Design an enzyme around this catalytic site. Structure first.
Site, short mmCIF file in Angstrom:
data_model
loop_
_atom_site.label_atom_id
_atom_site.label_comp_id
_atom_site.label_asym_id
_atom_site.label_seq_id
_atom_site.Cartn_x
_atom_site.Cartn_y
_atom_site.Cartn_z
CE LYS A 154 6.82 6.56 6.58
NZ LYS A 154 6.52 7.90 6.11
CD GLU A 180 8.06 15.06 12.16
OE1 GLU A 180 8.66 14.59 11.21
OE2 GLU A 180 7.13 14.16 12.47
NE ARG A 181 1.07 16.57 8.48
CZ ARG A 181 1.50 15.61 7.55
NH1 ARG A 181 2.46 14.39 7.96
NH2 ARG A 181 1.27 15.69 6.32
#
Ligand SMILES: Nc1ncnc2c1ncn2[C@@H]1O[C@H](COP(=O)(O)OP(=O)(O)O)[C@@H](O)[C@H]1O
Ligand SMILES: Nc1ncnc2c1ncn2[C@@H]1O[C@H](COP(=O)(O)OP(=O)(O)O)[C@@H](O)[C@H]1O
Ligand SMILES: [Mg+2]
Ligand SMILES: [Mg+2]
EC number: 7.1.2.2
Lengths: 467, 48, 488, 507
Positions: A154, A180-181
């Protein structure tokens, strides 16, 4: 103006204004904090009381605590001086490389373009990837969505999209990581740096980052798409450019809006979501449409819960979607990187009235020949007629060559693999798959198509393999 | 063996179709259960 | 200033402006905010008035002065709205100048009683071979297009709209048409390309487009098909025939769900409240043929309802089937098989359409419906069939040839005499020596041949609505002569 | 209809101006519910701020709704009465941290509970601080070794990350945590500061007798140098179970700011969500889904995203979070498992039919995955586990075809046999973690396929005899593997030789 914090529940603190009052959807600087504490006003209840979703850790807030009111809905720094910069939804740089020295600010919580500010021409947005621009091509003003994961490529496809659109068209891009991590965001930031999309050395980077992390309250996560869309709307409306908003996750946007509307006391909707789901997706997903001047285009990574399509967040998402390119590991373990499934990628623009009769004829030929290869692959795996016919062996050879040809060496993978990354325009993809389906290159081995850009370099690879 | 292979191919296909139909009705039943439980909790907290 | 006729916003919150005073107001009244906006005064209380706005809440402060208009919620109306994209309240948003409306039609009146109504009797052709042959529409009628995401749903309505150009360039006002397209919750780009395809097809003279898209507010999407019914209801009361399409009427119910839940109303089934049936019933029920004492005119409503993964019985499709007197049904697995449009003819009804036929289509498509009803028991017998009867295989193959004949591309609706001529070449088995990879090729071939060389018999079909016996013999002659002279 | 409008405070307000209770630093207790006081006064208190009650109690104050402070009682609500005097402490609640908390079971306010003396802490860290951002952290650069062969091969942990242990009740899931703790004895015995370790076991709402069993298992495995055990059992109050993971995570944040590495095991973090739902629904905060309110994801994310490796400027400290979730009959689609699986960077999934089918530890994978679980391995385990993962991926497709595998072809038969030998290599006894070197040796033997001829019930006996043989005779080869970090062709040739000879002399 100057009001006062009078009650605090997390991202729900309400301010009592005694004088001139901010309208719905506005910003507030809570003072006395070591940082800024921006708040978002909505609900005027009385004694000018406004229920502000409060955007950071609200430990330390006292009753009667003074709040300055700034007017504007939220001002963020937009510009060409924002590229390579990580900011968060206040507009504040969190990559620790100084402030974002730009000239023009812009307000998130803007509106959709008018009906007269629209483009009535569905121009096919050409990425440059063969499988994308041949089997699920993109659209200027599209709202397209990629169905990926962890092991699939991805990030490689995202950086390849950024480089191909920045080279072919003249467009920069923005990456809004919604929820978002911080580990994954840090790895994606170092990945863009070591790939060359972001340059920390000079002014040649190609993406602006807006990371709204998970550790922030949902008031500060339902605005990440709005912030990245505001930066991309600067690129749309003051350069007239071909822009890409990459939202890494539409489900965390919907979940953040759901938790905001849960914290604001609203009776929740169906399966657990907010009443305002279709309206909030309407506001954002209709600001990302094309205009007469620019062509903002969202590519958005989407999470379906419980592997369900009828859930309301994918229901509204697929109500706004256009392409839905699948990424997977099956054709990746077939060696093709990354496994963008076309048989599960139903683009709406695949229509000979829009993309042309030659393009649609080639795309139907490719998809039909791979479907027939999947059926005959099942039969040749069970060994019922063992090579069923000459037509069976012919279509197995053709479609095996096509599946090897759907690969493309990527320029973001050039720095550690010597397979140089090629850009393949639309006309060359059409010519290549048309000459493969026409039986012209039947006398070539199947290996001569794996990781090659155009078709004439596949000819030269077949020549250099014949040793 | 030929007709048994054919019968088990067709029975696997019919079973896969019925798995698909029952997964769709499982999902809509799941969503109805979540919405029912949610409306009961919201009705309790509102009538409080 | 005066609390009789003006009032002040106490607390605008999620979708409600509780305004103070405003004593001279009356229930369900368009009351306008000094932010240039409009709203409708809903529930009157002894302390405040709950006005729901017709836009965003961002433009409205607290204590912003609210002023009565003096009349119930209206929309501008007339033949001066023809050819034009309007908002849900009536403002022209296509940018080409303001509207020249003189009348003013109320947005929320009741449907007519059972006496001024008269039953469906005029034929409304969509132009689609499948729809007009099997599930036809009448001028007078409510016909729900039910289908899934990305199925066929808008294109059937666009073909129905584009079809009316030949009637509207004609002479008789008892055949011309005025069509309304109420896009509820759509993408604004889709409405833009809709208007572009209608302008490209010169398909706008009938056409009003009432646009309340997704970025518009949800109580503005609540009001849009009511405004469209006011347009078509003006045409119906004046005695001019009218059409209306409700694109994604499920999104109208989603918007009403969300504003209902912001009013803290008790939610019912899958969070839709009790008022959803009353919503779509007072919406759809304004369609009727008018008795000739009441002018003589008609409305034809076509809602478009959206099901999640083929769920014909979810909650809202059951309601809007229980309201509409026809459910033109669609499927998706047909749409992946390549048949366009994907009409599930055995499950697709249109109910009361088989009294508004042409009487040529009765002579040519009753036998078609019977021969295609013979096909709906033999598909499994064709799956497990190696030793079948010759007659059973013959009727199976004729059903295959008819369901290949019903395929049709975008944006080329058929004339009714062209439909009768094609189906006449299709029913009694001139296709039976042809292959199903060639029937659409054959169909385009003799359609061009009949429309070029043999226009006179098409004039005789469309003139007297019947296949005359001499016309029957000549049309048999020309189908046999084309089938003899047409190689591959 | 007001909450503070009662005739007591109204009467003392209008009979004469008081100015005596001072209304700002102190405050009188109004309606005291089942665990939540709604005190009047405290005009200068801040949000999330720990006050004390005149009985001698503590309690942290949230919701402030313009006239009232929602203080949740840190204890039994039997001895708090209406009208009592509260007092501000002046600071958001702190946790006493340090290297003197080690080997002593404490309680979530930072106070000793095992009765073996007080804690000698020197500094108190403010609990609930913000997580470190993007630039101060870096990714997993050290391999976090569980000792479980299935975990360390297929789904390895990284020193620098969060890995959610998920399963049904009584399906491993704490035995993996105790093996993760006891494995770190051999790394805490000697040198290499960047290898030694500090485990923090935060038990949330367990029985207290099983916390006594846990600490007895750690003491008689001598696991009290690395370990702190923070305990907020089921008898303790709802907010004290709420505040237990943040206390241990603040201790681990002390350990990772000062250069050193640490992990934390949140046992029954779903029960922490349950305690937060209890206290919020008694604060009458609006319930979201399954009665969990809005900020539950924000709660677990603010808790769990404090775990990351730090860049070489900010020490080299790393944290490893290991939350534990009981699911209700495999319902991974519930609220809290979906929230924490979307938060955490990996999952170790335990489907229970493998447990009763007799492959223990119960990590029944295929749903289980680690999103970084190839770079968080030593190159020995990287090579062997990569080939082993591909072999098991080829095995698990065909097991339903292996129940009828006797009358199929031979290629399958070989593949399914190799998968059966590997799957019975992955089982392991409880409370005996293997070092990296010997599990590299065992899984190497299974991958090179010196086991395909043996009986299935004789694989585990071979495993134990091979551990005894390799530990006893060939110490230098495990020294080669643990010092080089990999097999480099001489360990490969010597392992060819020794496994061929030991297969020649097994029975
Ligand atoms: N030849 C055709 N005939 C009919 N419909 C078609 C044809 N080709 C494409 N379509 C479909 O028409 C659809 C128009 O959208 P539609 O499904 O009617 O409504 P929506 O997708 O907005 O719910 C497109 O999704 C497209 O797939
Ligand atoms: N060899 C083994 N490997 C893994 N787990 C085991 C083994 N033997 C026993 N267990 C189980 O592991 C469990 C650890 O407790 P846990 O599952 O956390 O309790 P709870 O049922 O409260 O979740 C014990 O109840 C025990 O039954
Ligand atoms: Mg549509
Ligand atoms: Mg347990």
């Amino acid at each position: 103006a100057t009001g006062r914090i009078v009650a605090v529940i997390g991202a729900v603190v309400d301010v009592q204004f005694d004088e001139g009052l901010p309208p719905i959807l506005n910003a507030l600087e809570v003072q006395g904090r070591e940082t800024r504490l921006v708040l978002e006003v909505a609900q005027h209840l009385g004694e000018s009381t406004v229920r502000t979703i409060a955007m950071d850790g609200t430990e330390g807030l006292v009753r009667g605590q003074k709040v300055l009111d700034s007017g504007a809905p939220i001002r963020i720094p937009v510009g060409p001086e924002t590229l390579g910069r990580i900011m968060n939804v206040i507009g504040e740089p969190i990559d620790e490389r100084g402030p974002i020295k730009t000239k023009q600010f812009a307000a998130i919580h803007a509106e959709a373009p008018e009906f007269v500010e629209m483009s009535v021409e569905q121009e096919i947005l050409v990425t440059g990837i063969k499988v994308v621009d041949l089997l699920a091509p993109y659209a200027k003003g599209g709202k397209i969505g990629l169905f990926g994961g962890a092991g699939v490529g991805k990030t490689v496809l995202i950086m390849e999209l950024i480089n191909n659109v920045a080279k072919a068209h003249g467009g920069y891009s923005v990456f809004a990581g919604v929820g978002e991590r911080t580990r994954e965001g840090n790895d994606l930031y170092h990945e863009m740096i070591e790939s060359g999309v972001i340059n920390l050395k000079d002014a040649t980077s190609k993406v602006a980052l807006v990371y709204g992390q998970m550790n922030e309250p949902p008031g500060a996560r339902a605005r990440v798409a709005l912030t990245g869309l505001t930066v991309a709307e600067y690129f749309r409306d003051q350069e007239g450019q071909d822009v890409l908003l990459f939202i890494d996750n539409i489900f965390r946007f919907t979940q953040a809006g759901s938790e905001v509307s849960a914290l604001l006391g609203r009776i929740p909707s169906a399966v657990g979501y907010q009443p305002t789901l279709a309206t909030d997706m309407g506001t954002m997903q209709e600001r990302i449409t094309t205009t007469k001047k620019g062509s903002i285009t969202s590519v958005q990574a989407i999470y379906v819960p419980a592997d369900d399509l009828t859930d309301p967040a994918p229901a509204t998402t697929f109500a706004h979607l256009d392409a839905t390119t699948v990424l997977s590991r099956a054709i990746a373990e077939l060696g093709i990187y990354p496994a963008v499934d076309p048989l599960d990628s139903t683009s709406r623009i695949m229509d000979p009235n829009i993309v042309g009769s030659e393009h649609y004829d080639v795309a139907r030929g490719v998809q039909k020949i791979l479907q027939d290869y999947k059926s005959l692959q099942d039969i040749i795996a069970i060994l019922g007629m063992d090579e069923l016919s000459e037509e069976d062996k012919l279509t197995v050879s053709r479609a095996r060559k096509i599946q090897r040809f759907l690969s493309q060496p990527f320029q973001v993978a050039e720095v550690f693999t010597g397979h140089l990354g090629k850009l393949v325009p639309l006309k060359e993809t059409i010519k290549g798959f048309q000459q493969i389906l026409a039986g012209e290159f039947d006398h070539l081995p199947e290996q001569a198509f794996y990781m090659v850009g155009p078709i004439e370099e596949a000819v030269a690879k077949a020549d250099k393999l014949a040793e | 063996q030929s007709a048994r292979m054919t019968a088990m191919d067709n029975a696997s296909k019919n079973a896969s179709e019925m798995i698909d139909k029952l997964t769709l009705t499982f999902n809509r039943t799941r969503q109805a259960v979540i919405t029912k439980e949610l409306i009961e909790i919201i009705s309790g907290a509102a009538a409080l | 200033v005066d609390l009789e006729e003006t009032g002040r916003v106490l607390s605008i919150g999620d979708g409600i402006a509780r305004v103070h005073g405003l004593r001279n107001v009356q229930a369900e009244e368009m009351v306008e905010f000094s932010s240039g906006l409009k709203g409708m005064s809903l529930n009157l209380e002894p302390d405040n008035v709950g006005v729901v706005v017709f836009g965003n809440d961002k433009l409205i402060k607290e204590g912003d002065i609210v002023k009565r208009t003096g009349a119930i919620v209206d929309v501008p109306v007339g033949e001066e709205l023809l050819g034009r994209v309007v908002d849900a309240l009536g403002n022209a948003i296509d940018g080409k100048g303001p509207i020249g409306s003189k009348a003013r039609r109320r947005v929320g009146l009741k449907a007519p009683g059972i006496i001024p109504r008269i039953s469906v009797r005029e034929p409304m052709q969509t132009g689609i071979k499948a729809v007009d042959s099997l599930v036809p529409i009448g001028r007078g009628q409510r016909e729900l297009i039910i289908g899934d995401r990305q199925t066929g749903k808008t294109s059937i309505a666009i073909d129905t709209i584009i079809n009316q150009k030949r009637f509207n360039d004609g002479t008789d006002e008892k055949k011309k048409l005025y069509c309304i397209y109420v896009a509820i919750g759509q993408k604004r780009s889709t409405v833009a390309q809709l208007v572009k395809r209608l302008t490209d097809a010169d398909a706008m003279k009938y056409t009003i487009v009432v646009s309340a898209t997704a970025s518009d507010a949800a109580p503005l999407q609540y009001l849009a098909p009511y405004s469209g019914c006011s347009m078509g209801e003006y045409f119906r009361d004046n005695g001019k025939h009218a059409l209306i399409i409700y694109d994604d009427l499920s999104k109208q119910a989603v918007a009403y769900r969300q504003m209902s839940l912001l009013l803290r109303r008790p939610p019912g089934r899958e969070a839709y409240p009790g008022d959803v049936f009353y919503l779509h019933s007072r919406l759809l029920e304004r369609a009727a043929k008018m008795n000739d004492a009441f002018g003589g005119g008609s409305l034809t409503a076509l809602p478009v309802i959206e099901t999640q993964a083929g769920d014909v019985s979810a909650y809202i499709p059951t309601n809007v089937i229980s309201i509409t007197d026809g459910q033109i049904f669609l499927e998706t697995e047909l749409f992946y098989k390549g048949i366009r449009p994907a009409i599930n003819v055995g499950l697709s009804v249109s109910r009361v359409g088989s009294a508004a036929q042409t009487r040529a289509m009765k002579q040519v498509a009753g036998t078609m419906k019977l021969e295609l009803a013979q096909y709906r028991e033999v598909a499994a017998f064709a799956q497990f069939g190696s030793d079948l009867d010759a007659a059973t295989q013959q009727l199976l193959s004729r059903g295959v040839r008819l369901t290949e004949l019903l395929k049709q591309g975008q944006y080329s609706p058929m004339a009714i005499e062209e439909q009768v001529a094609v189906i006449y070449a299709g029913v009694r088995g001139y296709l039976d020596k042809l292959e199903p990879s060639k029937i659409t090729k054959f169909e385009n071939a003799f359609l061009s041949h009949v429309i070029s060389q043999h226009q006179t018999l098409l004039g005789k079909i469309r003139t007297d609505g019947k296949i005359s016996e001499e016309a029957d013999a000549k049309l048999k002659e020309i189908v046999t002569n084309f089938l003899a002279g047409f190689e591959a």
